[PDB]
Symmetry: D2
Subunit: 311 residues, 4 copies
């Protein structure tokens, strides 16, 4: 409504979350361990195109799991809900089944878990080599960001692949259970998966991608239709219930917004018909979510009444 006054509250919330110094920076690969715990950035892009940034918003970092809802949207956009959900489920697994790769029907629980993102990766642009598949997804992310920063980290790619024994275990398990479409080169799909995890954004460019999802699939800084209404609706439902790892249920109850976190410390946040946001702070909590970002999200809903069922 009054954008100038709203940005002052964003700056206040940014400053309050800055004092929250807890957490541990992810250190399983040296490309994540490198990062300073003090980096903290918040970028907002409204559905009308209004922008606002505070902090470290032009420093590139990997999307990691923040790419999961984006490639799911691309798959539904090109293939439809029915085809995509023959290979992947549509609900959270719960704390009891959080270590199992598949559900009762031999399908990955949802697109937001590793097994589900690996199957979704196998459905995109079938029939062409990995170079063409990667270019096709980059072309799509550039439209979602309004041609803003979309890069690639080769160091992260080489490190994820050399140390991803758990993902290779998922790959061979999905192959044994017939989870992939026929004629899938599983090892090549894992390569394409590690490449998508290694795509780099800034808070500024990623907030535009979140504002595309908040604006019914239309990029707000170009006015271009990028995703179908069906792809956007399905991505937002699954971000609301499955996007914050084992904290998804607490986040749906207290925050009630579609969001997705990554191991780099990013939280892609969507406020439907209002704005898109990207919070980034490398230190993660026990659940794997950014400590500063989680604090910021709780304060944002309390102050601005953005929760789905807020009156």
């Amino acid at each position: 409504p009054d954008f100038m006054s709203f940005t002052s509250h964003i700056d206040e919330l940014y400053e309050s979350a800055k004092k929250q110094s807890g957490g541990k920076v992810a250190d399983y690969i040296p490309q994540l361990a490198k990062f300073s715990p003090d980096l903290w950035g918040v970028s907002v892009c409204t559905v009308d195109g209004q922008r606002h940034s505070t902090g470290d918003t032009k420093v590139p970092f990997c999307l990691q799991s923040c790419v999961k809802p984006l490639k799911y949207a691309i798959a539904v956009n090109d293939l439809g809900t029915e085809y995509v959900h023959r290979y992947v489920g549509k609900e959270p697994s719960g704390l009891r089944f959080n270590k199992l790769f598949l559900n009762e029907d031999d399908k990955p629980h949802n697109p937001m878990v590793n097994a589900g993102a690996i199957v979704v990766t196998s459905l995109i642009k079938q029939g062409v080599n990995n170079a063409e598949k990667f270019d096709y997804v980059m072309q799509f992310l550039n439209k979602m960001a309004g041609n803003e920063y979309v890069g690639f980290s080769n160091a992260t790619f080489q490190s994820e692949r050399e140390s991803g024994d758990r993902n290779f275990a998922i790959g061979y398990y999905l192959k044994e259970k017939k989870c992939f479409p026929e004629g899938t080169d599983m090892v090549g799909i894992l390569d394409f998966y590690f490449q998508l995890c290694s795509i780099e954004v800034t808070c500024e460019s990623a907030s535009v991608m979140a504002a595309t999802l908040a604006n019914g699939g239309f990029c707000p800084i170009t006015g271009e239709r990028v995703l179908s209404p069906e792809a956007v609706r399905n991505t937002l439902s699954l971000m609301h219930s499955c996007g914050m790892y084992d904290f998804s249920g607490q986040f749906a109850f207290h925050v009630g917004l579609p969001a997705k976190s990554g191991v780099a410390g990013g939280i892609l946040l969507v406020v439907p018909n209002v704005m898109g946001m990207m919070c980034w702070s490398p230190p993660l909590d026990k659940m794997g979510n950014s400590v500063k970002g989680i604090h910021f999200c709780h304060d944002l809903v309390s102050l601005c009444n953005f929760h789905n069922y807020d009156n």
Copy 2:
């Protein structure tokens, strides 16, 4: 917007769902088995007070599990979110842990499962006898329905109590795990629980209760504040993710509205800032939800674009 034209679409959807004759009427007690499979009613109450009914909308039936979100709302209204959630969790259990009474922290998964509703019943109006507790809840349901039909089935009460061995197993298990507030007479709480399950409504009176939840806790036919905004928001989040038994996840994805089903064939449905509805048809599917009601809900969201993340 144009109420007259909207009711014609409700009548069309009612007629389309009427042809769906599948399902089985619940028969574990004779009071549920009695019911005709052909009974089918739909009542709408908007947040402005506009009413519309089609079918068997003045035939009383028991709320059964449809009372779970209502007593949860009363508990949060009187005690607050923090106190209530020391005893009960706030998320779905999943298909893996659908037979366990408690979660990792020795708490019932959420207020929408039997163990959770039993603990919530133990928190309401503590310190008084069951007659006063029952009157207090009836007084609250009468305000939610705008003084419309709220009755009681003694036959259902006596039958639920004489055959509820599973609920008695939950009661003793919660007592062993220290799930109740100190000085709780567990057997007396089970009695109060069977009584609340036996409360009778019509489609007409129950649609007013659903419209109270759709209107920020204000009854639309009286203008009286019945529930606090905090109680309404929490009830709607848990109805969205836990309200349709093992179908909750499919319903959140395809329908995306807060709803709650019961073994009598009722589906209490909320469309925030628009209306409240009660669908009722005794035959249930394998998941325990009304066959006609589930069909009606899917058609309603497709036609009127009421899904949470619909643009």
Copy 3:
């Protein structure tokens, strides 16, 4: 072989286990908490009738779970293997399913877990009242002990019943799943169960009961046939794999003898065609087994080569 020299090794092992002061005396009821941690007794009865005792062997204590294999033997003796195993399974549950009352077929895992012992109690001497059922089992235990000390603790009975909420949860759960024979008064079976748990023995009398199982069902101090060969064989197989709570698998691997522990600190031990033993020391470890008794059993197999697969 040379009994005099063998008793000197028993006295040495007794003295070595005496130095092992770890553990905690069970304190859930005051009748168990009363007990001194320093009480330690070992009694041996060979299949030929040779006796030897060291320590506190004439102090009465409750059998508790040590009665589970004894009532199972009585059930198989009177009804046969086929009838008994229509109601109860015949294998360990494992660490994953150690909190579930039933297995995949809606049956208790084995007679050595609480749910299984409750179902076995429901099969003994059906058609008569609890006073006659109790007398019938006492008559049987007196034959197993060669008319040596078999008493009853009323204080333990009243305390087990007043605080056994977990057993009442099992009782109502088994009733819901149709686990009992038709026309079973479940509450009366729980009463009979608490009574059997409260039967008192000494190390001396209990070693005779273990020597009856070691001697093919013939009491070694009377020569009387008490149990059928089929009842003895089935009891010994289930004591070998299910008798030491969550330590059953480690005990089968390192000790390899049929044994059964109880919360009073007793370990009923059988060495087939050699002898029966009862070790008793109130302090229990994290698994619920007597610390001194477990130490003694490990030393006994190492020294005398009694393990099933020892050459």
Copy 4:
């Protein structure tokens, strides 16, 4: 005792089991599918060296899972109980955890499951290449069989490796959880594993290997010490509780002998201080055990009273 008369009962039991035509020959690789359902052989080797064969006892088939207890014995023989069980557990998993690769302590449940056999394979003769490791195990199996038929199927090896996606998923999962000794080439260990599964025996040569285990680790046809008493005792305990897949618990209760089945239809059976046996019939039941072999084992214990706890 009277060998001539005993062989007549073996011939009678062979003839009775021959009429049991149920089951399905394993068909996941063409090398198993090839096999006739009518092949049925029984070979006996006593601890004194007495031999007897009936049926198809000189037709070679792969050991498959029948090699699991043999390589476990070799590992304990060379490294001891303590070192081996730092990497692998010592008990059955149960029906609830029959699809999980690891137990509560991030270790494979026991050496008789695929994950456990893969870890055991990683412990044998470390520091040398796969050709030397394979020769070392062949040298050991030749001593166990008294220099009787021990071959190799290259076709089975190439087929197991090309289609073993589940074993590759186990391999990468064990690598992620740090289950192998440091500096393990996991892919090379999987190769060595597929090679050991492809070793070929006849009923005659395999009954000598089972008689080595029945004779305290001394080969009965040569008198040579092959395995240590500790290796034999540990192998027999784990064959008794974990050797017949999901039927292990029913087999321990009804048969009570150490045994191990394989997908080729073989059942390696040990009667301690009496004899070793190998039953072979390609058609398997739902549990994966040979239909004729299971029938034969039940008849053998009933007739000759060989059950561990038989008087």
